[PDB]
Structures are given as structure tokens and as C-alpha cells.
């Protein structure tokens, strides 16, 4: 395999520390500069820092956002790159990936040109920084403000609120109801707790013909909730 | 707040052409050189353009690049269904730490069905949640194509931006898209105003729903 594989991600409290590792296979690791990058939920990629090759001095550069808190090092004998993270902040929550710099060479008559780019990319490891304790969700019914229109369609659902950590799973009518069902990704509230919604769209005439129950499962807290929703 | 700014999405039909722009500052794009990458879901980024306008091995000439001032552009002609992916630009900063910097990414949709406007349902806070001394407005958005929307909230007639979270669109079963947005309020704020609105903009057209405490 020609690859980079990160490990070490997990949940840590603010102020805490965590070390990530990145193991290279299939190429000459000692010849390349390496980067750490990260991507926070709903955000774009941010470079964290680099370490150069031994031949280029082995020095490290860091993004201003992590300077003085994060340290990158490498062990060429083990084909391994490290990111030591200290004084972690909630805003450090992200998927962390390692990459190599590669280059395209263009020969000229008197000078050769080297264009660098991020070449080999790891799949990433998830780091979550939160002070939150495990907590099961509250479940609230979602029903519309006014009566559904005759001949039209109706939407109803469940708001699954204030749980930690991820994930929860939601089914409807014990999994028998799947048509017209969508369960949305979670959002993270100011509180440090997550929320998501799940809905089903049905014919207005279907209302009154059967019951609609959302089944919420939050394994991390060993909580299951069944909530009927009435229109 | 990505360092380089790209449009969230672009679309065209098979055989047609598109451009994807990348906007930065003199400290990045202005004085340095731009790369473009292609990325499919669950795959690694693939280099398409380097040095502003050069193509690496195996990249066909229907991909091209230009740089102008503090902006750069990726051009793709003869669109294929297989080109549907995220495209992002990169360069580096001119400071001594020399950060690599990135665009937020652009979702390219290669149109394979008619554009479809979103269905929007705005749910008010439930009596149960109000009894728990909280209040959440839930704007659910579904069956839109291509998969990009923007969401704006209003209390009465005024914009509200605080207490808003919105999810990135996800594919449904019929290959159309859904998204959700939340407005967090105190029970007091909810009772105060005469209405709240969720406005969803898709492909230049806005769909709006409103709820009123004195109607639910």
C-alpha cells in the first residue's frame, strides 16, 4: 500500500492533551515534507503545520491558531509523523489528516523548476473537544401550525434535542415506515449538546388512518424513546 | 470564513462548460501560485491544475486554469456525469510560516433532472418544549435539486441571525436533496413577536414560510 494512516483521535476535555500518529507505507518517508491539516464540521480545510525532511533541516512551521499549543515531530525509523496537541480548545474540534508535499518537475535549459503540492492524503482521525457529559435526548413532536390541506400532503416529525455524544438513530413505526422519511444531520448548540430532526411526509388523507411514532435510539446513554406525533 | 472564497455550488448539463472562481488577497493568491483539486465523496483530493494554469499527467485539456490579480478560475468544458464532485483551490500565504491555504470548495452538479424548488415546512415550538422553558423553530427543507440552498430567518420583518444552525444538504432517495435549519429562542421571545419566518433561496428563487404564536 502507498498510503498515510492516522490514528489517536477521540474525545478530550478543554485544556487537555492528545497525541495523533500518522504512519506512512509504500514510499520513502524520510524524503518528504509532511503536513497536518484539519476540517471542522461545516467548514473548509485549514492547514495546521508542517515538518520538513531531515535533509532540509527537520524544522516545523505552524498556523497562528495553534502556535505554542501544538507540536509536530517525526520518527523516520518508524515511518511515523506525530501531532502533540496541548491546551485543547473546543474550536480545535475537527477531522485531522496528514499529507505529504509532492512535486512536479519541469526541466529548463539553465534551471529546473519544481512545483509543490499536497500529494498523498490520509483519511483522517476525528478529534472532539468538549466539556460535555453523556446525556440522553429529549424528544419533542414536530407538527404544523395549521390543519393540512385536503388533497394535499402533510409533514410531521420529531425534534431530538440536547444529547451527547453523537450519534442517535431514528426510525418510524419501528422501522416499518420508510417512505417519505428523512433524518437530518445533527447540529451542535451553544450548550455543547447536539440536536437533530427526523420527518415524514404523508398524504393528508393518510392522517387519521394510522399512528406515527418516532423511535429514537441513543446508544451512548442507553436511552431509547418512542414518541407519538399527532396532527 | 475559509481563507479563499469560492461559490458554494455551480451546475450545468452534460456537454456544457462551467467556471469555478476562487477569490483571495495579495498575501495568498496575488503573489503566489494556485492549485485546483477534485474530490469525490469518500475519496482523496486529486490534483487538476498547478502553477495557475498547468495540467499534471493524465488530466485532459477540457480542464483549464487562469489567475488574475487576487482571483483564480477553474474552467471545465464538455462536462461528463463523472465530473460531478467538489472542487477546491489552494495556494500559500506570503508570511514566514508559509501556511498552505484553501478554498471552501464548490459542489459541481452535472444536471441530470429538471431543477426542483424546495418544499419548506416551518414547525413552531411544541407545547412540551415551551413547558421545558425552551423554544426551537425548525425549518425543514426537502426535494430540491441541485443540492444547494441558503436560509434566512426573520422575527416579524427584521432579520435574525443569532441562534441559527443550518445543516449541509444531504441526498434523499429520489436523488433530490434535503436540509434543515433551527432558530433557538426563549419562550419569551417566541411570545413577544407576532411572527417568525424561514426564507429558503434556491437557484435564485425564494420560498418563505411563517408561523405565528397566536395561531399555534
Amino acid at each position: 500500500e502507498v498510503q498515510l494512516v492516522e490514528s489517536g483521535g477521540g474525545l478530550v476535555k478543554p485544556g487537555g492533551s492528545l497525541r495523533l500518529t500518522c504512519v506512512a507505507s509504500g514510499f520513502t518517508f524520510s524524503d518528504v515534507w509532511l503536513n497536518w491539516v484539519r476540517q471542522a464540521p461545516g467548514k473548509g480545510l485549514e492547514w495546521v503545520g508542517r515538518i520538513k525532511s531531515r535533509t532540509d533541516g527537520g524544522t516545523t512551521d505552524y498556523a497562528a491558531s495553534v502556535k505554542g499549543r501544538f507540536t509536530i515531530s517525526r520518527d523516520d525509523s518508524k515511518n511515523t509523523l506525530y501531532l502533540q496537541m496541548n491546551s485543547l480548545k473546543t474550536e480545535d474540534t475537527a477531522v485531522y489528516s496528514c499529507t505529504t508535499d509532492g512535486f512536479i518537475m519541469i526541466r529548463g535549459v539553465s534551471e529546473d523548476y519544481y512545483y509543490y503540492y499536497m500529494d498523498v492524503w490520509g483519511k483522517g482521525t476525528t478529534v472532539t473537544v468538549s466539556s460535555a457529559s453523556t446525556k440522553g435526548p429529549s424528544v419533542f413532536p414536530l407538527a404544523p401550525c395549521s390543519r393540512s390541506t385536503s388533497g394535499g400532503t402533510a409533514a410531521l416529525g420529531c425534534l431530538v434535542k440536547d444529547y451527547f455524544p453523537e450519534p442517535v438513530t431514528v426510525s418510524w413505526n419501528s422501522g416499518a415506515l420508510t417512505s417519505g422519511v428523512h433524518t437530518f444531520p445533527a447540529v451542535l448548540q451553544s450548550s455543547g449538546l447536539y440536536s437533530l430532526s427526523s420527518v415524514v411526509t404523508v398524504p393528508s388523507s393518510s392522517l387519521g388512518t394510522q399512528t406515527y411514532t418516532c423511535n429514537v435510539n441513543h446508544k451512548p446513554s442507553n436511552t431509547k424513546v418512542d414518541k407519538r406525533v399527532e396532527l | 470564513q475559509s481563507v479563499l472564497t469560492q461559490p458554494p455550488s455551480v451546475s450545468a448539463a452534460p456537454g456544457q462548460k462551467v467556471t469555478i472562481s476562487c477569490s483571495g488577497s495579495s498575501s495568498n493568491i496575488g503573489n503566489n501560485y494556485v492549485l485546483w483539486y477534485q474530490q469525490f465523496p469518500g475519496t482523496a483530493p486529486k490534483l487538476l491544475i498547478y502553477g495557475n494554469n498547468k495540467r499534471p499527467s493524465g488530466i485532459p485539456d477540457r480542464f483549464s486554469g487562469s489567475k488574475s490579480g487576487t482571483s483564480a478560475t477553474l474552467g471545465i468544458t464538455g462536462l461528463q456525469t463523472g465530473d460531478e464532485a467538489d472542487y477546491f483551490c489552494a495556494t500559500w500565504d506570503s508570511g514566514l510560516s508559509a501556511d498552505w491555504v484553501f478554498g471552501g470548495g464548490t459542489k459541481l452538479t452535472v444536471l441530470s433532472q429538471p431543477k426542483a424548488a424546495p418544499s419548506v415546512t416551518l414547525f413552531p415550538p411544541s407545547s412540551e418544549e415551551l413547558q421545558a422553558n425552551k423554544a426551537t423553530l425548525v425549518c425543514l427543507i426537502s426535494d430540491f435539486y441541485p443540492g444547494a440552498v441558503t436560509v434566512a430567518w426573520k422575527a416579524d420583518s427584521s432579520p435574525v441571525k443569532a441562534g441559527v444552525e443550518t445543516t449541509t444538504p444531504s441526498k434523499q432517495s429520489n436523488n433530490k436533496y434535503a436540509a434543515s435549519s433551527y432558530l433557538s429562542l426563549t419562550p419569551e421571545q417566541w411570545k413577544s413577536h407576532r411572527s417568525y419566518s424561514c426564507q429558503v433561496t434556491h437557484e435564485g428563487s425564494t420560498v418563505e414560510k411563517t408561523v405565528a404564536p397566536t395561531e399555534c
Binding site: 515534507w33 508542517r50 520538513k52 512551521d61 508535499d101 512535486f103 539553465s110 534551471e111 529546473d112 523548476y113 519544481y114 512545483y115 509543490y116 503540492y117 | 503566489n32 501560485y33 502553477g51 500559500w92 500565504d93 508559509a98 501556511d99 498552505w100
Partner: peptide
């Protein structure tokens, strides 16, 4: 000589 186009690299080396 070599010209290096990328972050952190010495621009020209000989």
C-alpha cells in the same frame, strides 16, 4: 540551478 515554487522552500538553490 533549481527554482522551487511552493511554501517554505528556498526560492532558488544551486
Amino acid at each position: 540551478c533549481r527554482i522551487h515554487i511552493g511554501p517554505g522552500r528556498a526560492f532558488y538553490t544551486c
